[PDB]
Design a binder for this molecule. Structure first.
Ligand SMILES: [Ca+2]
Ligand SMILES: [Ca+2]
Lengths: 170, 170
């Protein structure tokens, strides 16, 4: 069957995604907060579920384990405008099948939900390492002040760790 | 006990890490390729293991499951100069306990190996969203040419998805 649960507090985004999925033949329900997500996930069987992390006042990450318990057969994808390695690690531990940064289109969201999608994506990443172009001197200073710690340096510079690393790469 | 296995093909980096761990009382073995890693992990019990992804001619990612089978009690950390969400997702599925971008110092490597470290790091990330500063017009063009897909856009621009997202953020 093709029942899809979209969990995101942004109802406009959620509606656009729902309409795109419906045009592809999915039957879509939306939840805009943790109460609604648990109500829905306790009432109907879903084959696919998307989960926003910054769920208004609620933690989307905190929903993943309870969702897996309610929906053991569902494929579950974190779909987030706040992407980070740290949340991706914890989301997978909690039971998420995959994790995608916004913006993503409907085709890529469906792709990311399929069996083995993560393994393909990991290989593609290893084949395509990223490098990014006075700023250099400022980052070398903050990095040295943080005992050569990119995580601490990332937080101080208000940039992603991945961005720091790509900029530091030869 | 405090037996530590460092798996990295860069023997200079591996030696510097080993010496820093030894000064903290760990007994360290190094493996520089997949053959050595499996030989060591089949011969002695380790409490901690670090795994490089781009392991010379070898896949570090491919080592994680066999290492968990040989070393069910070990804490296992991916430590990589090629960080990506996609490899972090797959590494955790394979059994890694955590994942850190290089450069990291010895204190942060040890921190990342402790129980519950990932959950703390995920919370810290959600509290500290990142935003980054004509380039805008070029990224809006590639994004539109890729059907609003940040993953495809990231690969085309040769930048990290996280970097794109932070630069797109309001
Ligand atoms: Ca949100
Ligand atoms: Ca390497």
């Amino acid at each position: 069957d093709k029942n899809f649960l979209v969990i995101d507090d942004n109802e406009v985004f959620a509606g656009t995604l729902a309409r795109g999925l419906e045009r592809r033949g999915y039957a879509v329900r939306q939840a805009h907060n943790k109460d609604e997500a648990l109500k829905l996930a306790g009432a109907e069987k879903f084959e696919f579920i998307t989960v926003d992390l910054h769920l208004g006042n609620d933690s989307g990450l905190s929903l993943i384990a309870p969702l897996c318990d309610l929906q053991p057969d569902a494929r579950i994808l974190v779909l987030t405008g706040y992407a980070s390695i740290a949340t991706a690690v914890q989301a997978v531990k909690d039971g998420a099948d995959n994790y995608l940064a916004k913006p993503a289109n409907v085709e890529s969201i469906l792709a990311a939900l399929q069996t083995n999608a993560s393994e393909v994506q990991a290989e593609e990443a290893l084949e395509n390492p990223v490098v990014l172009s006075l700023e250099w001197e400022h980052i070398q200073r903050v990095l040295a002040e943080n005992n050569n710690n990119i995580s601490a340096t990332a937080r101080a510079l208000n940039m992603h760790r991945r961005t720091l690393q790509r900029k530091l790469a030869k």
